[PDB]
Coordinates of N, CA and C and ligand atoms in Angstrom, one line a residue:
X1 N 0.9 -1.2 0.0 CA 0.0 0.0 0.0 C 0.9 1.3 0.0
X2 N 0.5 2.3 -0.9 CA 1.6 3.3 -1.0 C 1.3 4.2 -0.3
X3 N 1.8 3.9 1.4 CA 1.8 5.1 1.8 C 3.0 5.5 2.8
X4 N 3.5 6.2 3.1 CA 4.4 7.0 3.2 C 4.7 6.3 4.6
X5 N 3.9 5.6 5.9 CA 4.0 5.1 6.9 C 3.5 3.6 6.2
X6 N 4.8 2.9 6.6 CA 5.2 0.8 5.9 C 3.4 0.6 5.8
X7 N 3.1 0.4 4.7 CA 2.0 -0.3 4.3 C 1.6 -1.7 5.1
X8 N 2.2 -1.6 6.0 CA 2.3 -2.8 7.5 C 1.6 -2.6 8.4
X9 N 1.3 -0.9 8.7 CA 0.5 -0.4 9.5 C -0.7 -0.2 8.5
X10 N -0.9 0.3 7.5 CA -1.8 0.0 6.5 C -2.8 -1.3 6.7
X11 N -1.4 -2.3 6.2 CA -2.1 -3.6 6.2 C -2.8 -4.3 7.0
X12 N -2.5 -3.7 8.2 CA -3.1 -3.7 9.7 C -4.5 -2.4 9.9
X13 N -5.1 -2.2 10.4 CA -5.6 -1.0 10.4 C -6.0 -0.3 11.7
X14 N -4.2 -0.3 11.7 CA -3.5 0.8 12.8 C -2.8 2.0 12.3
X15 N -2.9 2.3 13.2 CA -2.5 4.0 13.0 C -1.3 4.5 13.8
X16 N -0.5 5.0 13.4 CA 1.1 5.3 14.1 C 0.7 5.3 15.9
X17 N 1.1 4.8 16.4 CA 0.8 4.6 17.8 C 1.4 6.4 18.4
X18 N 0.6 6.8 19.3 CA 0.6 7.8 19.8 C 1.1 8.0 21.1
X19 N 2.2 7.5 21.6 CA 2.6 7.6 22.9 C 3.3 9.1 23.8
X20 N 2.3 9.0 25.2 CA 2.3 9.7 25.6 C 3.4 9.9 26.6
X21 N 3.4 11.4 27.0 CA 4.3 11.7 27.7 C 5.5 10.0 28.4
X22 N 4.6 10.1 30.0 CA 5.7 9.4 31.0 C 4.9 7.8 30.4
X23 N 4.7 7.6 29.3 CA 4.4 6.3 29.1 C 5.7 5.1 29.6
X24 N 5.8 3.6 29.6 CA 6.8 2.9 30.3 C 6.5 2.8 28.9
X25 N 7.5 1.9 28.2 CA 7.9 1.4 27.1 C 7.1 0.3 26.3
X26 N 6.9 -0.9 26.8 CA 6.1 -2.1 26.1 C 5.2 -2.0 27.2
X27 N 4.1 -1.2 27.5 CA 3.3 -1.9 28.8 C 2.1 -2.3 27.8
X28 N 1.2 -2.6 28.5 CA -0.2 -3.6 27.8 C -0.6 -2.7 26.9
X29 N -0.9 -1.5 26.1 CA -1.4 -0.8 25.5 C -0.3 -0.7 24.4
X30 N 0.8 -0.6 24.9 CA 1.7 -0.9 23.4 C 1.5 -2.2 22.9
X31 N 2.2 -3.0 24.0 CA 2.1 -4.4 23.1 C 1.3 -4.8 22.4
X32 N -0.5 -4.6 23.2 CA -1.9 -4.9 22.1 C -1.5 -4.2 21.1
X33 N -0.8 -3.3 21.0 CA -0.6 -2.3 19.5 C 0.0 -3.1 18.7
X34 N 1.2 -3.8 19.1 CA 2.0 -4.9 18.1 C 1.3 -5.9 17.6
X35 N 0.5 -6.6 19.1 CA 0.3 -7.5 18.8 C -0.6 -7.6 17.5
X36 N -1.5 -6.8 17.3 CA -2.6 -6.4 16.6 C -1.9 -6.8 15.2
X37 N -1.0 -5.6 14.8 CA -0.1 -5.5 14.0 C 0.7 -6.7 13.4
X38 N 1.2 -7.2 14.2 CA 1.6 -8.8 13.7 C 0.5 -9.8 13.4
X39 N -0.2 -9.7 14.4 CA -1.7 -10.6 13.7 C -2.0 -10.4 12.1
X40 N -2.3 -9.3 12.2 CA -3.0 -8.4 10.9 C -1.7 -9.2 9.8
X41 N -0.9 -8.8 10.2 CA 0.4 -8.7 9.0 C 0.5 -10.4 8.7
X42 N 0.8 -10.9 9.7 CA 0.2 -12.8 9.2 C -0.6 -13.1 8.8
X43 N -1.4 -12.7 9.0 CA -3.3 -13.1 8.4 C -2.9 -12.9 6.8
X44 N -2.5 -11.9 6.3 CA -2.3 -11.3 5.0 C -1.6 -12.0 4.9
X45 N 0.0 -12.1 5.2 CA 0.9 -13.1 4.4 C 0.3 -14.2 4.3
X46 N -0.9 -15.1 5.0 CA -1.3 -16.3 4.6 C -2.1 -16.0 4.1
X47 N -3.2 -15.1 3.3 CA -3.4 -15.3 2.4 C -3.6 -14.6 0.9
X48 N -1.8 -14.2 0.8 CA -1.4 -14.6 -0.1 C -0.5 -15.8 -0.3
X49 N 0.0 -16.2 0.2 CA 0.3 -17.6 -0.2 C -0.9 -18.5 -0.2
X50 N -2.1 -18.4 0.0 CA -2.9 -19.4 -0.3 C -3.1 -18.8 -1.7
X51 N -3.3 -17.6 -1.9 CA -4.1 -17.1 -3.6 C -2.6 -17.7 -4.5
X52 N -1.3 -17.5 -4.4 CA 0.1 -18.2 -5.2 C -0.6 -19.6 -5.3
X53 N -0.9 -20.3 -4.1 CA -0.8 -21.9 -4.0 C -2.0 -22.3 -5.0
X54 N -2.9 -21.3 -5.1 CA -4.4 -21.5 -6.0 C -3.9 -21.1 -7.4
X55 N -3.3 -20.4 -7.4 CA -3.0 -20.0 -8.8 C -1.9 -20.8 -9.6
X56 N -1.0 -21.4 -8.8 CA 0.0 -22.8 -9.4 C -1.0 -23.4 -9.6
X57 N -1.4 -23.7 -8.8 CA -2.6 -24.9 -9.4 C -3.1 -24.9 -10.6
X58 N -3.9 -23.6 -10.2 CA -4.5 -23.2 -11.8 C -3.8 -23.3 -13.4
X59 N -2.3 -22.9 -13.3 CA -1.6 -22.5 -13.9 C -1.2 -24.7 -14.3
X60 N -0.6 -25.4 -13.3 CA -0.9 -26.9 -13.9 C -1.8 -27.3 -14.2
X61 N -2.9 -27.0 -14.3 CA -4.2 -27.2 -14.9 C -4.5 -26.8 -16.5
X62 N -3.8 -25.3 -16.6 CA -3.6 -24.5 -17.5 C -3.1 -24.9 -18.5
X63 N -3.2 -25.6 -19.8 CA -1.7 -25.8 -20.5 C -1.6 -24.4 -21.8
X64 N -0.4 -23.9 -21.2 CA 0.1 -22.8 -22.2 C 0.2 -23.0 -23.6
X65 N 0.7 -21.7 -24.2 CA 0.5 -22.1 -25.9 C 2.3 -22.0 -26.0
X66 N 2.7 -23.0 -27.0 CA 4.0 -23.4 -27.0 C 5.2 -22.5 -26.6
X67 N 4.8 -21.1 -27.5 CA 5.4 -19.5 -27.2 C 5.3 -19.3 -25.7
X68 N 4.6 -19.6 -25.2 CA 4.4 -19.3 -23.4 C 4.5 -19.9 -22.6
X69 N 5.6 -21.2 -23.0 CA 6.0 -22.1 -21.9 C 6.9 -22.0 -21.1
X70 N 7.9 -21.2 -21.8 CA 8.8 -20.1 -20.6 C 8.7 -19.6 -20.2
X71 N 8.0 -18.4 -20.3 CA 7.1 -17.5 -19.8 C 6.3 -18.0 -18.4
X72 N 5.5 -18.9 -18.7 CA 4.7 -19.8 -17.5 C 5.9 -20.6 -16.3
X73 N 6.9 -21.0 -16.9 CA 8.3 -21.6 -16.0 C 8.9 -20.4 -15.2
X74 N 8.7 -19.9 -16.2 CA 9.8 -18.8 -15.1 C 8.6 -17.9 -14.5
X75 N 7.9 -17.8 -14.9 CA 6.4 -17.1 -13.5 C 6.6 -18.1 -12.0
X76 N 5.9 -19.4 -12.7 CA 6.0 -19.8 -11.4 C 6.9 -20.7 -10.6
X77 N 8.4 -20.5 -11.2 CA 9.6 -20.5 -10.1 C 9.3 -18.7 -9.4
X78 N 9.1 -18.2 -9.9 CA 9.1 -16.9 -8.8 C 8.2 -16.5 -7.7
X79 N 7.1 -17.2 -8.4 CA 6.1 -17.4 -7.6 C 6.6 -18.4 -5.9
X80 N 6.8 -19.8 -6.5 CA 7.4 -20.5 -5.8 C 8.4 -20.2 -4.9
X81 N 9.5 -19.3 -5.1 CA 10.6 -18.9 -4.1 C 9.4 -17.6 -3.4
X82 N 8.9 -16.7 -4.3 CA 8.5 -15.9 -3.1 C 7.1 -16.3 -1.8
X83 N 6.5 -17.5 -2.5 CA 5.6 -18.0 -1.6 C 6.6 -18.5 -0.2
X84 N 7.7 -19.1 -0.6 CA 8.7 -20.1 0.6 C 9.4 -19.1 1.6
X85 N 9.2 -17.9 0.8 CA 9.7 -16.4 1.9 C 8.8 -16.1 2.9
X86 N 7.6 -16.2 2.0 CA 6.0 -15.4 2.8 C 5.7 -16.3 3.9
X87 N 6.3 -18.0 3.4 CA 6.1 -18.6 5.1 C 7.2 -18.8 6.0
X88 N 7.8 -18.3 5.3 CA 9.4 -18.0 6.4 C 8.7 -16.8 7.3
X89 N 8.3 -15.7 6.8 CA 7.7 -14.5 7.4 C 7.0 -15.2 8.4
X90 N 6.0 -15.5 8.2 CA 4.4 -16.1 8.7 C 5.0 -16.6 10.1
X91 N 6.1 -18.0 9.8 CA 6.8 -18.5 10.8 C 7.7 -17.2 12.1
X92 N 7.9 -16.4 11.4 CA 8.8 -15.7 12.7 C 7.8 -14.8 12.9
X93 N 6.9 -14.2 12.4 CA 5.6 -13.8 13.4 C 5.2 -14.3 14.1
X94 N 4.8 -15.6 13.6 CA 4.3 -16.9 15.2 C 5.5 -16.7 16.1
X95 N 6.6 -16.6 15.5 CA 7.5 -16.4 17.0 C 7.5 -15.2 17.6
X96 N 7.5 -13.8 16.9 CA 7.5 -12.6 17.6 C 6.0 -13.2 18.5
X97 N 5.0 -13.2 17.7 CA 3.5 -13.0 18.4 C 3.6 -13.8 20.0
X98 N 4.9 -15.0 20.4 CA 5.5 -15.9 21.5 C 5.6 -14.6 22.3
X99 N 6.4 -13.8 22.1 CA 7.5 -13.0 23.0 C 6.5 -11.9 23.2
X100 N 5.1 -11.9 22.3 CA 4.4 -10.9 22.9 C 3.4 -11.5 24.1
X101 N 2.8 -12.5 23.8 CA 1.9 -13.6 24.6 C 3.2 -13.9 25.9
X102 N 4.6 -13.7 25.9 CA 5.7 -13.8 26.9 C 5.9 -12.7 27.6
X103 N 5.2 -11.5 27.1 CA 5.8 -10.6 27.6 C 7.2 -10.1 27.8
X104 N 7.8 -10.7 26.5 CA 9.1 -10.2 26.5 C 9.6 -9.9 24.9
X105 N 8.6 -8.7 24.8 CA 8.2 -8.3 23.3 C 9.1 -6.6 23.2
X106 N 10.1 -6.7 22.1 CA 10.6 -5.1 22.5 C 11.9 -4.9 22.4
X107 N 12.6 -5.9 22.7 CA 13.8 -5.9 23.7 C 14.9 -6.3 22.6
X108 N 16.2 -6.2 22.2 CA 17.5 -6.6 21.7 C 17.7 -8.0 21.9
X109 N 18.2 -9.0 21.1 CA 18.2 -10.3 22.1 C 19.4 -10.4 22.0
X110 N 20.5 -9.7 21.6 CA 21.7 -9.9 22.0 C 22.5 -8.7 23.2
X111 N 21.7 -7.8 23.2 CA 22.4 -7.0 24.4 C 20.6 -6.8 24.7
X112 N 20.5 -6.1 26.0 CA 19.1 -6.2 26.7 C 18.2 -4.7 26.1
X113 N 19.0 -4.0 25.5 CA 18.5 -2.4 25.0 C 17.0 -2.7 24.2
X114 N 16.7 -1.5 24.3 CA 15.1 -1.8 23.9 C 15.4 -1.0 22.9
X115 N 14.6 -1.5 21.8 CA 14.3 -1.6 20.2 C 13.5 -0.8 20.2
X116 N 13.5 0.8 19.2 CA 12.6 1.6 18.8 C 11.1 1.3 18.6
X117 N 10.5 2.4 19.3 CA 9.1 2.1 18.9 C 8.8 2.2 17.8
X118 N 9.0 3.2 17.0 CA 8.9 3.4 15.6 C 10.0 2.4 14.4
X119 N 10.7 1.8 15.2 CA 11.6 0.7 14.1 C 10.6 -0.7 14.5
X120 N 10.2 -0.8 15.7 CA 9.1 -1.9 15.7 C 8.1 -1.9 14.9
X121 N 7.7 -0.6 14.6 CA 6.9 -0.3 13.6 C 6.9 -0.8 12.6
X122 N 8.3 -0.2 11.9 CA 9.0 -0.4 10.7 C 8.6 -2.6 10.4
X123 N 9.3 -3.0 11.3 CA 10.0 -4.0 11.2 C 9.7 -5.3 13.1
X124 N 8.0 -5.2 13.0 CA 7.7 -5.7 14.2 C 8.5 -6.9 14.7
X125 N 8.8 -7.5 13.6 CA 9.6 -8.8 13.8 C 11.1 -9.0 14.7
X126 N 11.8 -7.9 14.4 CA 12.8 -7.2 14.4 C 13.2 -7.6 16.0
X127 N 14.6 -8.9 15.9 CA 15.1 -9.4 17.0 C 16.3 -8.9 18.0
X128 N 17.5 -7.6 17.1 CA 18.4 -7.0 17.5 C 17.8 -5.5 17.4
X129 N 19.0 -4.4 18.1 CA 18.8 -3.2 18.0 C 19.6 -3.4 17.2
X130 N 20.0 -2.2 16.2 CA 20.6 -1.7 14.9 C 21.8 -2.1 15.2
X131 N 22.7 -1.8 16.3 CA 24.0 -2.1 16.1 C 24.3 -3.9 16.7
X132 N 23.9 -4.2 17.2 CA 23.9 -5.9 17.5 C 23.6 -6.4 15.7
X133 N 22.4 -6.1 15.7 CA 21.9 -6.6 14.2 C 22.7 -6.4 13.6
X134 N 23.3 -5.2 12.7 CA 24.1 -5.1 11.9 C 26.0 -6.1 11.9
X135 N 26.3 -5.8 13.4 CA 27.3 -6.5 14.2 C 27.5 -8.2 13.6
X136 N 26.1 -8.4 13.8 CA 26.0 -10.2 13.6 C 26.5 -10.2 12.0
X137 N 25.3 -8.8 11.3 CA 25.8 -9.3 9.8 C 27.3 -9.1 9.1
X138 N 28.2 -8.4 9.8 CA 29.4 -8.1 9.6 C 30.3 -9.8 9.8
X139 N 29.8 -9.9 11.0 CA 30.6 -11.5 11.6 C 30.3 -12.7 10.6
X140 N 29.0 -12.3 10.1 CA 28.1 -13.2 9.2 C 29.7 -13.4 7.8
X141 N 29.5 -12.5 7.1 CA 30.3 -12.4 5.9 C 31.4 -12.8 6.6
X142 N 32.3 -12.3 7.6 CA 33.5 -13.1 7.8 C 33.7 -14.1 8.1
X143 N 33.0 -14.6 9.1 CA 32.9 -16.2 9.6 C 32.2 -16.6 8.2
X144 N 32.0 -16.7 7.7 CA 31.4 -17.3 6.2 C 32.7 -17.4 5.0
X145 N 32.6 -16.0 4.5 CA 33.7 -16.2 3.6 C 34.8 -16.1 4.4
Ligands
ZN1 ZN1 21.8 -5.0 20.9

């Protein structure tokens, strides 16, 4: 959804959370705010992967005209890798939506610093603060290559 605040809050139908003054950080009124938001945002990712899973179908059911058999191959390999993302997604929502139902929704998991409300926003999933996260991906490329 093209709008200027992640089409995530969009896709949810929430509205930039408004926190007040001496508010505490994740208390019950934030978190229902995530939680909502991650609900919302999984519901959608499943079902678009169910309309991809209906539309493969469709599409082997379909038989193309000889000119459009590549065309149809390479649609739905794309389809295919991006459905296997959407339940990659789906899966670590079920896990954020844990840490919300845990009450320990918010938080860095490699140093204890608490994660922006507005980058929760961004990215409700979102398991490090910026520099831990980024940190891991640095170690990632050298312990790799
Ligand atoms: Zn950290």
């Amino acid at each position: 959804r093209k709008t200027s605040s992640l089409s995530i809050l969009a896709i949810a139908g929430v509205e930039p959370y408004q926190e007040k003054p001496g508010e505490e950080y994740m208390n019950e009124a934030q978190l229902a705010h995530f939680r909502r938001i991650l609900e919302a945002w999984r519901n959608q990712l499943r079902d678009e992967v169910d309309r991809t899973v209906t539309h493969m179908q469709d599409e082997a059911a379909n038989f193309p005209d000889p000119v459009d058999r590549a065309a149809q191959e390479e649609e739905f390999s794309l389809e295919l890798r991006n459905r296997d993302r959407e339940r990659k997604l789906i899966k670590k929502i079920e896990k954020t939506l844990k840490k919300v139902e845990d009450e320990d929704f918010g938080y860095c998991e490699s140093c204890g610093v608490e994660i922006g409300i507005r980058r929760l926003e961004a990215r409700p999933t979102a398991d490090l603060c910026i520099d831990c996260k980024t940190l891991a991906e640095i170690r990632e490329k050298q312990m790799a290559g």
